[PDB]
Design a protein around this nucleic acid. Sequence first.
RNA 1: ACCUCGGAGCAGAACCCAACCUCCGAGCAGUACAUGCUAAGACUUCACCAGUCAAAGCGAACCUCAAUUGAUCCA
RNA 2: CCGAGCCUGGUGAUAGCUGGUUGUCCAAGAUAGAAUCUUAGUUCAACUUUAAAUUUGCCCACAGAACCAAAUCCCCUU
RNA 3: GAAAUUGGGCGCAAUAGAUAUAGUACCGCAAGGGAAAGAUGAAAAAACCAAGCAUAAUAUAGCAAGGACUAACCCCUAUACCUUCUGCAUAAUGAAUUAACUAGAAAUAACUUUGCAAGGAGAGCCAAAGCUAAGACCCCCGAAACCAGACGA
Lengths: 140, 91, 95, 55, 120, 41, 85
Amino acid sequence: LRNRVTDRYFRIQEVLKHARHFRGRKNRCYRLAVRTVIRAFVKCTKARYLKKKNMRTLWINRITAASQEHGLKYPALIGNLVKCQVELNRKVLADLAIYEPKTFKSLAALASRRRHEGFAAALGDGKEPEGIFSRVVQYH
Amino acid sequence: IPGRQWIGKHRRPRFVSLRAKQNMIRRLEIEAENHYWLSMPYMTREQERGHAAVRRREAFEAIKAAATSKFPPHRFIADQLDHLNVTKKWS
Amino acid sequence: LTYFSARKGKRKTVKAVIDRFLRLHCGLWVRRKAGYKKKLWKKTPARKKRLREFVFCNKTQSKLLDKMTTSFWKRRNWYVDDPYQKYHDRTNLKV
Amino acid sequence: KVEGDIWALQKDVEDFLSPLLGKTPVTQVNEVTGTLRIKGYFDQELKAWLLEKGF
Amino acid sequence: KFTRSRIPEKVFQASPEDHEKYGGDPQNPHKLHIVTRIKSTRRRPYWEKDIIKMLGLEKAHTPQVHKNIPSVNAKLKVVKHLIRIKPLKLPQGLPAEENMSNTCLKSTGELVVQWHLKPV
Amino acid sequence: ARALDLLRGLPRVSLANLKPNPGSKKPERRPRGRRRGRKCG
Amino acid sequence: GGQWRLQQGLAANPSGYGPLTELPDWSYADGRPAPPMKGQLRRKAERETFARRVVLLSQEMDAGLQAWQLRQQKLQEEQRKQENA
RNA sequence: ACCUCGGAGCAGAACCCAACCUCCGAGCAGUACAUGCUAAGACUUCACCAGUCAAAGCGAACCUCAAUUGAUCCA
RNA sequence: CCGAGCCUGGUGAUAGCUGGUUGUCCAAGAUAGAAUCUUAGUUCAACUUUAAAUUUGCCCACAGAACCAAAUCCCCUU
RNA sequence: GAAAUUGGGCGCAAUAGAUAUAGUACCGCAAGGGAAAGAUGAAAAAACCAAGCAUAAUAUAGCAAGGACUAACCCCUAUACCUUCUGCAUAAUGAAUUAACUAGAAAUAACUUUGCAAGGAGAGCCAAAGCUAAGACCCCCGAAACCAGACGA
Ligand SMILES: [Mg+2]
Ligand SMILES: [Mg+2]
Ligand SMILES: [Mg+2]
Ligand SMILES: [Mg+2]
Ligand SMILES: [Mg+2]
Ligand SMILES: [Mg+2]
Ligand SMILES: [Mg+2]
Ligand SMILES: [Mg+2]
Ligand SMILES: [Mg+2]
Ligand SMILES: [Mg+2]
Ligand SMILES: [Mg+2]
Ligand SMILES: [Mg+2]
Ligand SMILES: [Mg+2]
Ligand SMILES: [Mg+2]
Ligand SMILES: [Mg+2]
Ligand SMILES: [Mg+2]
Ligand SMILES: [Mg+2]
């Protein structure tokens, strides 16, 4: 054996330090550990697409929960906060509902005033002057 | 369904919702506008002849001159002698 | 072929290449056409004149015969009255 | 066998062969070994020019 | 078999009803298209995967100015199901070399040549 | 030349300073790893 | 909700053009302006080569129309300078 | 039963295109005896091997047929 | 353990057949065919890869491609 | 496949290196096959690290994890790996696991980098920019057999 491997101990511990919190022999035996440490790393990067998915689904379920307290549905709140050019995203709107429920009651009041201004413009077809909260601000 | 639901003689039936009908319709209205704006060209085919031939010919000449300028890079004495610096010490 | 001989340790050449082909020093191999003396009575005189011709080989056929022969058959040969003397050099290529 | 400033030679060859080509020739000096590698065949045209310089 | 499709010239002869729906002029038509790809080149034949590379529409939702000439329009007629064609309207004129660095292409298809971010 | 003037400031050429010409020695292509060998070419 | 923004002339994405994603995100507290964002330098450079393409392609048409407007006159006096002698 | 070559259909319009797919055939015969020699440029049975066509020129004169076939070995 | 003992040697028999072929990271990358005691294989082409040289490549318009359908070929502009 | 002719270690260090502590023990009637392994210190007249367990059995749910989380689990997401294939979670192959051992060896031609240059090369050889030198590409296990010579009724 001219040169055989003298540092094979440290190549095993590169993998086995990630497996210390496993079950069974996956935390000890190297042959069983690499098929799970690799699989624990692929799931770690495929769940960067699911954290952003499961946070937005959580924010939608926390805006839908709080908009129902004021009688609004979720598409009646997001759809009419856009129309008032109030570009708040789902993270803040779900964190306004928990920590500032007076401001969230004002955003539910505003998104329902614009909704009623959208119906009153739609039942009165033909040229009518616009609503007060329905006037867009133009940028040039 | 006897074998492989979506292929073969007996497949499971798939049906068209209001989603799939409205998705094809709003793609059919982008298409009808596409046929409108392609129906009125600015030039006829005889006016456009050679109207950008001087720019197309100079475009190829700069690809052709980049292709026939492939050559090794210059080799400096200050790249060969800088490897002497690996044994640069203090005193 | 024999890449390493057991007596010397060199390449041998396929001697069936030598009795069939002629290498010019430019790199071309020159061969006679197959069947040029077979059944000449049933051939038209145009077809008989095509067979009585030395024709060149392909690119891959020339690279296969170059591997089949050693470097002795790839040298300058300054013969006295070589009829293929004018064909060894290559004039006027633009690659 | 170029000794001295090979970069001055490379400019003088770029000023000599560019009328002979139209385009400036693409070269490569090898400042370690002291050569100059011009793309194309200018064997007789650079031998006659390096003789007029007295080398 | 599945071949390429010759679309007849009748399809690209606009009706006078069509000039009222979309705001185009038959006399004095527009000069520059704004081409934007809105469908993938996957599951499309190779003669449409290469036309999209010829027009520069390799990215979706990226606009591209192309001339309104019958040779560019012959390439847009091949891949019209993949793209969205709109006219580049110019309210102010084409930008000078002083107004070159302050332009913006809007979603209406117009190219404003003075782009502040201040309200009116 | 001027390159012999550059050698004065530079430390001495020893057997720990030498390096081949970049382009001479090619790396060996031996079949260990993911790419260079699984069925090994 | 971006089919409403396309009717007002805004970008369908609020992260497109407009005051939100083109103004500077910050400034120094004393009031000196920040160095511009790398995404604003990349967008303004991509908007310039678009506007350079509008200027280039429009002039290639207008110069290409005048060339045909001269070649159809040079065809015309060729018809009249042979009708003599 | 078949194995090579050719004509037609599938394969409707440049080429190509399978099948123990559908139908026909071929392994010759006849007439010349310059059915002599040479040589530009090409075609090509999806490679190669073979197969095709050919102006000019020399020399004289004043091939038909779809297939009609078989490499190398030096005697 | 006998359709021809067992052991050693030739012997590292031969296998178009199965199995195996060990550091890291990046890049390009898939399906016309022909011959073959050949169809579990190989050689050539085709495709692919690298390096090099050059000048066109792809998309295409009029016109054009035979007598007994969808399209293609060819093709300047662009 | 000729001839004339020419003239101590960029080794191994107890699965390595010899089979070898030994052709011994053991196996076969015989020819024949053929092992394993030891480690104190100047003097014996003087810890820490594999698998496996124990310390310390287990709590609904599911490739044994990941995103997480105040929190181990509960929630959400996720059909082991290798090989072979048109295609394998596949109820196709292989694998209990640990330690050690176990598999790409080279030619002309090209390419890259130097030297010198109509010549190169420390005879031989090549040369219509060549020539000399270097660098860089070619695996492992497995038959039933065949033959020669012994040894066996
Ligand atoms: Mg089924
Ligand atoms: Mg593996
Ligand atoms: Mg061919
Ligand atoms: Mg004639
Ligand atoms: Mg073997
Ligand atoms: Mg890739
Ligand atoms: Mg086989
Ligand atoms: Mg063309
Ligand atoms: Mg001798
Ligand atoms: Mg031993
Ligand atoms: Mg342990
Ligand atoms: Mg679960
Ligand atoms: Mg599956
Ligand atoms: Mg299994
Ligand atoms: Mg198997
Ligand atoms: Mg098993
Ligand atoms: Mg007895």
